[PDB]
Structure 1
Amino acid sequence: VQLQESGGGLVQAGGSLRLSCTTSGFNFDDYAIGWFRQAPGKEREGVSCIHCTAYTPYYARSVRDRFTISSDNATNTVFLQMNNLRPEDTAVYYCVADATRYPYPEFYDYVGQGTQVTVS
């Protein structure tokens, strides 16, 4: 179960970053996929997930309405589009996948390397 990430870097406010996560070694549809965030030294916080919630994707309270999670079953890819990046989002974003469809991306079994997001 390989989760390889891409995207990120340093931006200003409203930089509208975009992240991608390619998943391999399982059914892209069965496993709930998602992203979580971890500040440089603080506790990890879930960001988003698809296939977790029954009807609509799960978004955290502090990332609602300004983060969008998109799926591409053709290439088995998950995209995260950010909007209005406040300087409090300078952290590491990890792509996770799990065999159980429940909306807790911070406690999912698998996890990728992680990408750095810096906001000035």
Structure 2
Amino acid sequence: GSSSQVQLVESGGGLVQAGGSLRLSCAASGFPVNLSYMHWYRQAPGKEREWVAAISSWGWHTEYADSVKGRFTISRDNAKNTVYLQMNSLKPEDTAVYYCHVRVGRSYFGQGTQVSVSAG
């Protein structure tokens, strides 16, 4: 695994209508990320970095925020080395851009995609 750093790209972000469902994806490239947790953060405009979810190295530990509980489910694929986030039964208070965090050596963040949620 001769690489410079770990690059993280989000996918599946897009506009929704009412309490729909979103399919968020975080693809990592570079170093082996077999052993590292991956987190999901949100960045609402006018507010700081709020933490949303996390997944362990093998997916044995699923730890979530108290703000979104019972509807968000985080999942991992080690072979594709990609972390998914199922979102359902949403409210427009969840409208933010979602960053993907891993700390293989150094703390790494992604570009983020707009997970804008309409009112309905």
TM-score by length of 1: 0.85
Letter paired with 1:29: N
Instruction: Flag structure 2 segments of 5+ consecutive residues without an equivalent.
Output: 1-5
For residue 118 of structure 1, the aligned residue among 113, 116, 119 is: 116
Query: Whose helix proportion is higher, 1 or 2?
Result: 1
Deviation at 1:56, TM superposition (A): 2.4
Deviant stretches of 4+, over 2 Å: none
Name the SS for the 2:67 alignment partner.
helix
Structure 1 residue aligned with 2:79: 74
Aligned 8 A contact 1:12 1:85 in 2: no
Which whole-Å deviations, capped at 9, do the CAs of 1:26-54 have from their partners, x for residues lacking one?
A: 222212112100101201111111117x9
Q: Secondary structure at the match of 1:62?
A: coil
* Distance in 2 between residues matched to 1:95 and 1:80, nearest whole Å: 10
> Which residue pairs with 1:109 in the alignment?
107
Rg larger in structure: 2
SS in 2 for 1:10: coil
Three-state SS of the structure 2 residue aligned to 1:61 is coil
The correspondence for 1:44, drawn from 39, 45, 49, is 49
Q: Which has the higher strand share?
A: 1
- Partner SS state of residue 119, structure 1: coil
Identity among equivalent positions (%) equals 65
Cα displacement (A) at 1:24: 1.4
Q: RMSD of the alignment, in Å? A: 1.8
Number of aligned pairs?
A: 112
Contact 1:29 1:51 in 2 (8 A): no
TM-score scaled by structure 2? 0.85
For 2:96, the aligned partner's letter is A
Q: Distance in 2 between matches of 1:38 and 1:109?
A: 17
Q: Any unmatched runs of 5+ in structure 1?
A: 101-107
